[PDB]
């Protein structure tokens, strides 16, 4: 079933476009004029819709009757396949799970249980009473309000999309001499705050690495966040605990308004032979205690 | 329903840039189209060659 | 560059380069547990050029 | 930083003011990021060289990288006999004339950067004013709910300029294709054949042939046709936002509007100052009907 | 790191352990014929910074024959940090300090003929340059394990390389390994973090489910009279009236719902 | 931050957010007007 | 230290006042080099 | 192979002790013993030096660096100046609108004490010293009623308070003004009193509570450094929120934070937050 | 790395942890929420710096 | 060793005048100090303290923590008895 | 874990991995019937520093044991030496004798998947030339003892 | 001569600047720009 | 509904009071102080748990036997106390001072102060970034002119159904597409 | 030197859950009114 429906594209036929349709579509794609039909749907989107509804319309049961698969048959293939997984295989799996299932796992509700069982066409214990209960309760809202397909639809901060950060920026440069490319040069690219943009840079580096089929620098998150690293190390040594320091446990000292002046004139008057000296990753460290806190993790160093 | 209706409408229909008095439509102390003073100015003029 | 890159990619996983791929699972590594320090990233171009 | 961000906001704002197009925050910041990295490159290369300032006679010498860093100081034993105060002032003034020379260099460099930046903005800017629908009215013409009123005075003084040939479109692209047509016409001619064997010819081919760049050599390997981003004909960030969430739409259009207003206010301030400097305008409002009577 | 004449030149920075004292070296050969990196003996006193943890400047100071470069003709001194221009990770040598007589590298005027050995290559990204196809592979000392003149694809071909990267449809393409990247601030917001236990670190994120003894009467009263408010501990359960259940990683700052 | 922004998303109505995330929506009589559509939370009732 | 320059700080505002009523507010070399400190330490302050 | 900072290449003719290795002199047990002891205490001495450089306060370091900076070869004599530039200036005040006149320090001979005040600021009422009418009553202190003045003036939301002027009282004021619990303060060199300007924020005061340490003058509480150190610690988190003021043997009025810094104990005055 | 901390679930013996005797079996302690235990020598297979 | 300890006690130029030298003049033996350290030693090096560190972010999100069966989660009210179960664990 | 602790331990540890350690670990992987780890380890080894130095070497014993376990354990896409035929699989396969995979059909499906891939990625496929034919000459079928 | 834009007749201006910037709230340069600007327009520019 | 009218909230950034709160409800003297954990009377305790306090500890009326003691008093007391509590941030702003916790935010600022030396500090000579309009530009065209204006750059009939870009929206259209408009109209 | 460990501070209430913040209070999280310039 999986081979015929999902994997074989060549057997998939699409409704053929008329000549008028071909023209209107072309001229829509090449040059946009406002007020137009917002749909203009890519045959890519269409195709993927047909596939996902092929996953909708898949039902199990006796296959001497209509449907293709025994349930036992399905979980059998599933079991053979799950044992069959490599490292990056089950990595792809767990990513796929974190992206699709996991958020749904957070947004569920009793109101869905019937629908939740309609996926496998399994019959519940209480099915009539759940019919009644869920009918009465879904009565209290819009039908769009209650369907689990649409509950994830909006995401804050639409200016930077995860889809668009998949291609990492200027990867054809900082690949080739990663030392000449401190986090600053790239951080001018994003209109976000500090913690967020450094976070994003880490993700860029990792995506890039996995893309080029080489292993990523795991010391990179420690390098970009170095100040946060050392603050956490010294906090862990101070309050005795293992974890990451959170806000409640910060010192209650109140600095004066001008407290930063000394450091301000020290920074404003600094000077550097080259730009590498300006931002090297290790300028955070002076005493030996600094070097002992920064590398305590690698028993190599 | 009505309130967010109004919010969307007032936000989409708001003007921007500088007017004839050299200021924003939302500027603090100085105003434009007082008592439909421009509306009437179109009433009596009209647009024709 | 293409060869330095090729080699690094190959010693990352060999199973990417097989026509019929065998099972690819991570094993131990000879440099240490921190071996990534001596391994990672992409081949680097000479800085003069 | 400032001179750039002002111009970029000019572009973004204008882009939404004239046509209904929004620029993606992503894009807006990545322009600036490119300026920044340009400056950074110029810095990288600027530190490989040194500038020498010199004070009295030649007897106080200061060697400093153009960024203002100090590398060496040479001094006559004459200086050693002065005072600590005067020694300090002397060296400090040499350092100053060094920083001066360096800063002259850097400012040429920066002029160069500004030019590259402009050249990179040009397909966008000339993207918005080179369309058959683009227009402007004089800033002194009254605007009323129907449309814009006619400025009365000096019917000679108003000249409408036109950037577009009104007959069939000749785009910049046709001009570049014309340029390479003339390149080939010149090359393939007999006199051009003899010229391609000169030093001038091979300088031309080394700089401006990309086609002959060996595989893996830095730089573009084809000649590129000039980018075409016609503003009213290309949907950019408003269509994606309108499909996804209305709220981000309203917020981004709001940002563009605000930026445009701000730019316009700046232009009004500069105009006012230039008007005061030449004495046509007073230093406090003397004409309040120009404000209160609307 | 640059290339000339067939070999590498790298800038590096030698440093004491406390990084009090430092020396730059501009062009150093990267040569993997040296088991251990060699410096001029004179630097031993220049690099000695007697801190608190090392009352004498160095942890290790001894005499070795050191006849490899050219009976105790040299001195092993450790540990001196070394920062190479390309690499993000410091490399920690215990170098041979050689006097003038043992070996004198003055070799050209102003030029000290310093080089880097496998002491420091093992610790850098430079090490990946040591494998077949790299730029140091030519300069490895001859072995049964290292074939001198073989083409790269010949060698890797023997190790079992068949086609190019992900060329066969059976192996997934490298860049689909990571498709989605999760950043809380850019999408759906932060998690709602609760705990049952002593602290956030000592407890579980989970509340107790509906099947608890103390929750059953309450949940009952809550199913039957749905509209009025009900007393109980049944509030603390993972299950409740509202369509939004309490389970870990609820995104509560998300616009929808 | 003395006066933080708080929850700013208008994609649903206040009453729809309230409805989904709060049990308090089920008891409209027990809540004053100023708090009516304003709560996203579940409340426990303890009778002393 | 000389009580030549005095100040008054509100939450977000800063007042630097030159006090030398005897010589008619004529600043000495020390007092001026001091003022260029108080001015930029007041001006580079976080809350001003 | 170009080398920077390494001074003449290959140094100059210096072999190590172990490498050169001249034949070891046989010292009598005397010589050897003495070598061991002098070089042992040489190492001890060095360890001391390093610890002292580690523990040096920043102010000390700055004074040192800028002292060396100005250093000349000859120790030059001070230059004769104007008749004087160095009179501490009088803090500015307005004569016409006033709590009190700012009295010149040039009049320092005219001044009285807190007990027997010289006639000045006649146009203003004079605060009276607060003393017990009978035996069982507490014996009041300028600190006691300083705190209660401020507390009551904070409850009535007044801008200015006229308050008793003694050494530790205006000490307390300077400390509170440091921490920003008080908008400002001034001593007009009026004998009896001086004035404090209160600060309000968000409609109520900046001072939650202000309390004296002792009710009597006959009771004097001493604060161990460990106690003042306990205050700073809220179950493992460093808390400077609340301020405690105290006298030192050195007659300084300090908060508990500086006290803990230099590990000195002091006599308690008041708490405020 | 996290130091081992006393009075945990797998640390504390029965009578302090629960007021009852609970049998110590190396298989399936429901109270301790573990499925199974292979019981190697504590510090042997782990790295020492850990 | 602190303030409770026993006290330590205390025209021309002195012998401590000569050892001192201007940082402007090149010193005795040209010991290759690292610039960063001499910056830090005279107090002019821009500070990076723990005060400048923000939150340490979760970068790679761990795993879903699945509900671990406890003794208070049982589908029969009987299995959690008073004679058997004294608590969830 | 033991293999890491071999170079991590100051007291009992060796500076570089001894050959003894290598062939020991390999022998554990052979004796665990652990395929993936054996392959990856072998390749990692021949990519190590000790290998390039000449210190560790792949011997004939390691090599042939490696091959032994490579034969006798299940391969993900293919049937392996030491896969036992099942008489009763005829219930499904349709035949009692032969092996339940045909390398020819497997190759063909590989070609098909190659085109389906080029389509999924580029949206369009180049039609092969008319002179193009799949070369099946190099394929041999499964032999069974 | 246009040496400066600002002029005022108000007594003890300094106090009013202080107390005005006490009532102000945020540090975002939007806020700062408006607060400063409004201060300037209402007093130091001579509109009225 | 009287309880929802009186709702209070608590800033949990600090997770418990950072100073002692001494406050009395009518006749009931209450102390809310910082503790290592939650310590309180069972009822007061799960009231303080209702706020999400980890580190608070609280006591009502010295000795527990002290009058007046009612269930009412026990509740009203702890709620009154919590309602008198000041958050640390609020305290810090109250004195016009910067909290130790919020200083990290200044870091990027301070960072590019340090990094502004050299070219990054440099501005283009001659150019302010403020460019005033001088002339008036209008490129608009009569419809018949733009009918075939973009045929070479793009396809013919470029402006076809475009309502904003044409004075005659229906020109250039082939009959079918003209019919479509009316078709949706009726 | 601070012998109370932040590791163990608290009181188990049994089933009663309470919220904690990873960093700041959730209300202070999205700053969009100054970011997207919606303010008076
Ligand atoms: Mg300092
Ligand atoms: Mg009684």
mmCIF file of N, CA, C and O in Angstrom, chain D residues 1 3-4 6 10 36 39-40 43 106 110-111 114 129 131-136 139 161-165 167-169 171 228 230 233 270-271, chain M residues 115 117-120 122-125 127-133 135-141 145-146 148-154 158-159 165:
data_model
loop_
_atom_site.group_PDB
_atom_site.id
_atom_site.type_symbol
_atom_site.label_atom_id
_atom_site.label_comp_id
_atom_site.label_asym_id
_atom_site.label_seq_id
_atom_site.Cartn_x
_atom_site.Cartn_y
_atom_site.Cartn_z
ATOM 1 N N UNK D 1 25.230 51.411 10.593
ATOM 2 C CA UNK D 1 25.165 52.647 11.370
ATOM 3 C C UNK D 1 24.428 53.766 10.630
ATOM 4 O O UNK D 1 23.688 53.493 9.689
ATOM 5 N N UNK D 3 24.401 56.880 8.593
ATOM 6 C CA UNK D 3 24.203 57.362 7.225
ATOM 7 C C UNK D 3 23.525 56.314 6.359
ATOM 8 O O UNK D 3 22.706 56.633 5.507
ATOM 9 N N UNK D 4 23.844 55.055 6.617
ATOM 10 C CA UNK D 4 23.279 53.952 5.860
ATOM 11 C C UNK D 4 21.855 53.701 6.274
ATOM 12 O O UNK D 4 20.956 53.766 5.449
ATOM 13 N N UNK D 6 19.722 55.449 7.572
ATOM 14 C CA UNK D 6 18.805 56.494 7.133
ATOM 15 C C UNK D 6 18.335 56.259 5.701
ATOM 16 O O UNK D 6 17.142 56.321 5.403
ATOM 17 N N UNK D 10 14.725 55.108 4.229
ATOM 18 C CA UNK D 10 14.187 55.850 3.099
ATOM 19 C C UNK D 10 13.641 54.885 2.061
ATOM 20 O O UNK D 10 12.517 55.036 1.593
ATOM 21 N N UNK D 36 28.078 46.636 6.811
ATOM 22 C CA UNK D 36 28.926 46.397 7.968
ATOM 23 C C UNK D 36 30.107 45.529 7.602
ATOM 24 O O UNK D 36 31.255 45.913 7.825
ATOM 25 N N UNK D 39 32.780 47.228 5.665
ATOM 26 C CA UNK D 39 33.668 48.001 6.526
ATOM 27 C C UNK D 39 34.671 47.100 7.220
ATOM 28 O O UNK D 39 35.855 47.426 7.325
ATOM 29 N N UNK D 40 34.191 45.954 7.673
ATOM 30 C CA UNK D 40 35.030 44.997 8.368
ATOM 31 C C UNK D 40 36.170 44.525 7.486
ATOM 32 O O UNK D 40 37.309 44.435 7.930
ATOM 33 N N UNK D 43 38.758 47.029 7.212
ATOM 34 C CA UNK D 43 39.549 47.049 8.441
ATOM 35 C C UNK D 43 40.626 45.962 8.441
ATOM 36 O O UNK D 43 41.812 46.235 8.718
ATOM 37 N N UNK D 106 41.211 56.349 5.595
ATOM 38 C CA UNK D 106 39.981 55.667 5.925
ATOM 39 C C UNK D 106 38.798 56.387 5.321
ATOM 40 O O UNK D 106 37.884 55.738 4.839
ATOM 41 N N UNK D 110 35.906 54.871 3.005
ATOM 42 C CA UNK D 110 34.497 54.955 3.350
ATOM 43 C C UNK D 110 33.686 55.531 2.200
ATOM 44 O O UNK D 110 32.574 55.075 1.936
ATOM 45 N N UNK D 111 34.231 56.533 1.518
ATOM 46 C CA UNK D 111 33.559 57.047 0.334
ATOM 47 C C UNK D 111 33.353 55.921 -0.674
ATOM 48 O O UNK D 111 32.279 55.781 -1.288
ATOM 49 N N UNK D 114 30.471 53.662 0.496
ATOM 50 C CA UNK D 114 29.212 54.329 0.207
ATOM 51 C C UNK D 114 28.838 54.145 -1.258
ATOM 52 O O UNK D 114 27.686 53.840 -1.574
ATOM 53 N N UNK D 129 11.068 53.733 -9.045
ATOM 54 C CA UNK D 129 10.714 54.941 -9.798
ATOM 55 C C UNK D 129 10.727 54.760 -11.316
ATOM 56 O O UNK D 129 10.397 55.689 -12.053
ATOM 57 N N UNK D 131 8.932 52.586 -13.077
ATOM 58 C CA UNK D 131 7.686 52.027 -13.583
ATOM 59 C C UNK D 131 6.773 53.043 -14.241
ATOM 60 O O UNK D 131 6.821 54.224 -13.921
ATOM 61 N N UNK D 132 5.928 52.578 -15.166
ATOM 62 C CA UNK D 132 4.898 53.407 -15.788
ATOM 63 C C UNK D 132 3.906 53.955 -14.782
ATOM 64 O O UNK D 132 3.324 54.998 -15.061
ATOM 65 N N UNK D 133 3.693 53.294 -13.645
ATOM 66 C CA UNK D 133 2.993 53.998 -12.578
ATOM 67 C C UNK D 133 3.931 54.275 -11.435
ATOM 68 O O UNK D 133 4.242 53.427 -10.608
ATOM 69 N N UNK D 134 4.387 55.514 -11.423
ATOM 70 C CA UNK D 134 5.020 56.121 -10.285
ATOM 71 C C UNK D 134 4.829 57.606 -10.485
ATOM 72 O O UNK D 134 5.002 58.085 -11.605
ATOM 73 N N UNK D 135 4.516 58.350 -9.432
ATOM 74 C CA UNK D 135 4.438 59.796 -9.580
ATOM 75 C C UNK D 135 4.534 60.523 -8.274
ATOM 76 O O UNK D 135 4.324 59.961 -7.203
ATOM 77 N N UNK D 136 4.853 61.798 -8.389
ATOM 78 C CA UNK D 136 5.044 62.652 -7.244
ATOM 79 C C UNK D 136 4.398 63.993 -7.553
ATOM 80 O O UNK D 136 4.244 64.371 -8.713
ATOM 81 N N UNK D 139 5.932 69.366 -3.087
ATOM 82 C CA UNK D 139 5.667 69.323 -1.652
ATOM 83 C C UNK D 139 4.823 70.491 -1.145
ATOM 84 O O UNK D 139 4.238 70.412 -0.063
ATOM 85 N N UNK D 161 9.371 66.304 -14.422
ATOM 86 C CA UNK D 161 10.418 65.495 -15.032
ATOM 87 C C UNK D 161 9.944 64.061 -15.239
ATOM 88 O O UNK D 161 9.159 63.539 -14.448
ATOM 89 N N UNK D 162 10.393 63.445 -16.328
ATOM 90 C CA UNK D 162 10.016 62.068 -16.638
ATOM 91 C C UNK D 162 11.241 61.172 -16.863
ATOM 92 O O UNK D 162 12.101 61.464 -17.690
ATOM 93 N N UNK D 163 11.305 60.082 -16.103
ATOM 94 C CA UNK D 163 12.435 59.154 -16.107
ATOM 95 C C UNK D 163 12.332 58.046 -17.173
ATOM 96 O O UNK D 163 13.317 57.419 -17.541
ATOM 97 N N UNK D 164 11.124 57.832 -17.672
ATOM 98 C CA UNK D 164 10.794 56.733 -18.580
ATOM 99 C C UNK D 164 10.520 57.185 -20.011
ATOM 100 O O UNK D 164 9.765 58.133 -20.232
ATOM 101 N N UNK D 165 11.143 56.527 -20.990
ATOM 102 C CA UNK D 165 10.701 56.770 -22.363
ATOM 103 C C UNK D 165 9.239 56.361 -22.538
ATOM 104 O O UNK D 165 8.896 55.229 -22.215
ATOM 105 N N UNK D 167 7.379 55.842 -25.260
ATOM 106 C CA UNK D 167 7.194 54.805 -26.276
ATOM 107 C C UNK D 167 7.703 53.483 -25.704
ATOM 108 O O UNK D 167 8.015 53.419 -24.520
ATOM 109 N N UNK D 168 7.798 52.440 -26.525
ATOM 110 C CA UNK D 168 8.099 51.099 -26.015
ATOM 111 C C UNK D 168 9.321 51.067 -25.093
ATOM 112 O O UNK D 168 10.334 51.720 -25.358
ATOM 113 N N UNK D 169 9.189 50.306 -24.007
ATOM 114 C CA UNK D 169 10.155 50.265 -22.910
ATOM 115 C C UNK D 169 11.575 49.907 -23.320
ATOM 116 O O UNK D 169 11.804 48.877 -23.957
ATOM 117 N N UNK D 171 14.663 49.020 -21.146
ATOM 118 C CA UNK D 171 15.123 48.745 -19.795
ATOM 119 C C UNK D 171 16.646 48.660 -19.711
ATOM 120 O O UNK D 171 17.298 48.426 -20.726
ATOM 121 N N UNK D 228 16.525 42.907 -12.024
ATOM 122 C CA UNK D 228 15.251 43.609 -12.207
ATOM 123 C C UNK D 228 14.225 43.272 -11.129
ATOM 124 O O UNK D 228 13.649 42.182 -11.116
ATOM 125 N N UNK D 230 11.063 45.076 -10.445
ATOM 126 C CA UNK D 230 10.071 46.144 -10.572
ATOM 127 C C UNK D 230 9.126 46.088 -9.382
ATOM 128 O O UNK D 230 8.593 45.025 -9.064
ATOM 129 N N UNK D 233 5.221 45.274 -9.718
ATOM 130 C CA UNK D 233 4.982 44.004 -10.393
ATOM 131 C C UNK D 233 5.496 42.770 -9.646
ATOM 132 O O UNK D 233 5.276 41.636 -10.077
ATOM 133 N N UNK D 270 15.540 69.289 7.802
ATOM 134 C CA UNK D 270 16.655 69.774 7.013
ATOM 135 C C UNK D 270 16.220 70.961 6.174
ATOM 136 O O UNK D 270 16.927 71.969 6.101
ATOM 137 N N UNK D 271 15.048 70.850 5.557
ATOM 138 C CA UNK D 271 14.516 71.954 4.767
ATOM 139 C C UNK D 271 14.366 73.221 5.596
ATOM 140 O O UNK D 271 14.739 74.303 5.161
ATOM 141 N N UNK M 115 34.010 47.941 20.292
ATOM 142 C CA UNK M 115 34.267 47.460 18.935
ATOM 143 C C UNK M 115 34.113 48.543 17.873
ATOM 144 O O UNK M 115 34.233 48.259 16.685
ATOM 145 N N UNK M 117 35.903 51.188 17.393
ATOM 146 C CA UNK M 117 37.139 51.759 16.876
ATOM 147 C C UNK M 117 37.375 51.390 15.421
ATOM 148 O O UNK M 117 36.969 50.324 14.953
ATOM 149 N N UNK M 118 38.067 52.280 14.717
ATOM 150 C CA UNK M 118 38.421 52.029 13.337
ATOM 151 C C UNK M 118 37.293 52.375 12.393
ATOM 152 O O UNK M 118 36.614 53.380 12.585
ATOM 153 N N UNK M 119 37.120 51.547 11.365
ATOM 154 C CA UNK M 119 36.216 51.821 10.249
ATOM 155 C C UNK M 119 34.760 51.868 10.648
ATOM 156 O O UNK M 119 33.961 52.545 10.005
ATOM 157 N N UNK M 120 34.399 51.141 11.695
ATOM 158 C CA UNK M 120 33.001 51.078 12.086
ATOM 159 C C UNK M 120 32.539 52.432 12.631
ATOM 160 O O UNK M 120 31.346 52.738 12.597
ATOM 161 N N UNK M 122 33.556 55.216 11.360
ATOM 162 C CA UNK M 122 33.707 56.131 10.231
ATOM 163 C C UNK M 122 32.399 56.366 9.481
ATOM 164 O O UNK M 122 31.684 55.412 9.174
ATOM 165 N N UNK M 123 32.109 57.630 9.167
ATOM 166 C CA UNK M 123 30.936 57.998 8.374
ATOM 167 C C UNK M 123 31.389 58.527 7.010
ATOM 168 O O UNK M 123 32.447 59.148 6.915
ATOM 169 N N UNK M 124 30.574 58.324 5.956
ATOM 170 C CA UNK M 124 30.948 58.761 4.599
ATOM 171 C C UNK M 124 31.097 60.268 4.512
ATOM 172 O O UNK M 124 30.168 60.970 4.904
ATOM 173 N N UNK M 125 32.225 60.771 3.998
ATOM 174 C CA UNK M 125 32.368 62.231 3.962
ATOM 175 C C UNK M 125 31.396 62.896 2.985
ATOM 176 O O UNK M 125 31.308 62.489 1.833
ATOM 177 N N UNK M 127 28.055 63.046 3.194
ATOM 178 C CA UNK M 127 26.735 62.442 3.086
ATOM 179 C C UNK M 127 26.055 62.272 4.444
ATOM 180 O O UNK M 127 26.540 61.539 5.300
ATOM 181 N N UNK M 128 24.936 62.962 4.640
ATOM 182 C CA UNK M 128 24.212 62.910 5.913
ATOM 183 C C UNK M 128 23.159 61.804 6.001
ATOM 184 O O UNK M 128 22.722 61.441 7.094
ATOM 185 N N UNK M 129 22.760 61.266 4.853
ATOM 186 C CA UNK M 129 21.688 60.290 4.819
ATOM 187 C C UNK M 129 20.306 60.905 4.669
ATOM 188 O O UNK M 129 19.317 60.191 4.501
ATOM 189 N N UNK M 130 20.231 62.231 4.740
ATOM 190 C CA UNK M 130 18.965 62.928 4.549
ATOM 191 C C UNK M 130 18.954 63.623 3.204
ATOM 192 O O UNK M 130 19.594 64.659 3.020
ATOM 193 N N UNK M 131 18.189 63.060 2.276
ATOM 194 C CA UNK M 131 18.144 63.549 0.905
ATOM 195 C C UNK M 131 16.792 64.185 0.627
ATOM 196 O O UNK M 131 15.777 63.494 0.566
ATOM 197 N N UNK M 132 16.775 65.504 0.471
ATOM 198 C CA UNK M 132 15.525 66.212 0.236
ATOM 199 C C UNK M 132 15.072 66.083 -1.208
ATOM 200 O O UNK M 132 15.901 66.039 -2.119
ATOM 201 N N UNK M 133 13.748 66.023 -1.420
ATOM 202 C CA UNK M 133 13.214 66.074 -2.782
ATOM 203 C C UNK M 133 13.536 67.416 -3.422
ATOM 204 O O UNK M 133 13.528 68.435 -2.726
ATOM 205 N N UNK M 135 13.089 67.895 -7.525
ATOM 206 C CA UNK M 135 12.171 67.968 -8.645
ATOM 207 C C UNK M 135 10.918 67.142 -8.427
ATOM 208 O O UNK M 135 10.746 66.491 -7.400
ATOM 209 N N UNK M 136 10.049 67.184 -9.425
ATOM 210 C CA UNK M 136 8.796 66.457 -9.410
ATOM 211 C C UNK M 136 8.799 65.435 -10.529
ATOM 212 O O UNK M 136 9.053 65.780 -11.680
ATOM 213 N N UNK M 137 8.521 64.180 -10.218
ATOM 214 C CA UNK M 137 8.587 63.160 -11.250
ATOM 215 C C UNK M 137 7.269 62.432 -11.413
ATOM 216 O O UNK M 137 6.706 61.935 -10.443
ATOM 217 N N UNK M 138 6.773 62.375 -12.644
ATOM 218 C CA UNK M 138 5.599 61.566 -12.946
ATOM 219 C C UNK M 138 5.806 60.776 -14.236
ATOM 220 O O UNK M 138 6.041 61.345 -15.300
ATOM 221 N N UNK M 139 5.777 59.455 -14.123
ATOM 222 C CA UNK M 139 5.975 58.602 -15.282
ATOM 223 C C UNK M 139 4.685 58.056 -15.879
ATOM 224 O O UNK M 139 4.731 57.284 -16.832
ATOM 225 N N UNK M 140 3.545 58.445 -15.317
ATOM 226 C CA UNK M 140 2.257 57.910 -15.750
ATOM 227 C C UNK M 140 2.035 58.091 -17.241
ATOM 228 O O UNK M 140 2.526 59.047 -17.838
ATOM 229 N N UNK M 141 1.302 57.163 -17.840
ATOM 230 C CA UNK M 141 1.083 57.190 -19.275
ATOM 231 C C UNK M 141 -0.391 57.015 -19.632
ATOM 232 O O UNK M 141 -1.154 56.432 -18.863
ATOM 233 N N UNK M 145 -0.758 53.916 -24.778
ATOM 234 C CA UNK M 145 0.730 53.897 -24.767
ATOM 235 C C UNK M 145 1.255 52.665 -24.022
ATOM 236 O O UNK M 145 2.193 52.025 -24.528
ATOM 237 N N UNK M 146 0.634 52.330 -22.888
ATOM 238 C CA UNK M 146 1.106 51.213 -22.027
ATOM 239 C C UNK M 146 0.471 49.883 -22.444
ATOM 240 O O UNK M 146 0.769 48.865 -21.793
ATOM 241 N N UNK M 148 1.044 48.167 -25.183
ATOM 242 C CA UNK M 148 2.148 47.344 -25.717
ATOM 243 C C UNK M 148 3.506 47.762 -25.182
ATOM 244 O O UNK M 148 4.521 47.316 -25.744
ATOM 245 N N UNK M 149 3.525 48.569 -24.120
ATOM 246 C CA UNK M 149 4.781 49.113 -23.541
ATOM 247 C C UNK M 149 5.711 48.013 -23.012
ATOM 248 O O UNK M 149 6.920 48.090 -23.282
ATOM 249 N N UNK M 150 5.169 47.004 -22.327
ATOM 250 C CA UNK M 150 6.015 45.945 -21.711
ATOM 251 C C UNK M 150 5.992 44.645 -22.518
ATOM 252 O O UNK M 150 6.435 43.616 -21.976
ATOM 253 N N UNK M 151 5.541 44.686 -23.773
ATOM 254 C CA UNK M 151 5.447 43.429 -24.561
ATOM 255 C C UNK M 151 6.826 42.773 -24.702
ATOM 256 O O UNK M 151 6.912 41.554 -24.473
ATOM 257 N N UNK M 152 7.865 43.545 -25.035
ATOM 258 C CA UNK M 152 9.223 42.956 -25.202
ATOM 259 C C UNK M 152 9.817 42.459 -23.873
ATOM 260 O O UNK M 152 10.470 41.401 -23.890
ATOM 261 N N UNK M 153 9.667 43.231 -22.792
ATOM 262 C CA UNK M 153 10.235 42.848 -21.461
ATOM 263 C C UNK M 153 9.531 41.591 -20.936
ATOM 264 O O UNK M 153 10.221 40.673 -20.458
ATOM 265 N N UNK M 154 8.204 41.561 -21.067
ATOM 266 C CA UNK M 154 7.339 40.465 -20.655
ATOM 267 C C UNK M 154 6.388 40.175 -21.802
ATOM 268 O O UNK M 154 6.545 40.716 -22.896
ATOM 269 N N UNK M 158 0.245 42.907 -20.954
ATOM 270 C CA UNK M 158 0.801 42.808 -19.625
ATOM 271 C C UNK M 158 -0.196 43.300 -18.598
ATOM 272 O O UNK M 158 -0.487 42.600 -17.630
ATOM 273 N N UNK M 159 -0.733 44.496 -18.813
ATOM 274 C CA UNK M 159 -1.807 44.983 -17.957
ATOM 275 C C UNK M 159 -3.090 44.533 -18.603
ATOM 276 O O UNK M 159 -3.467 45.029 -19.663
ATOM 277 N N UNK M 165 -3.740 49.526 -12.210
ATOM 278 C CA UNK M 165 -2.723 49.969 -13.157
ATOM 279 C C UNK M 165 -3.301 50.393 -14.503
ATOM 280 O O UNK M 165 -2.561 50.814 -15.387
#
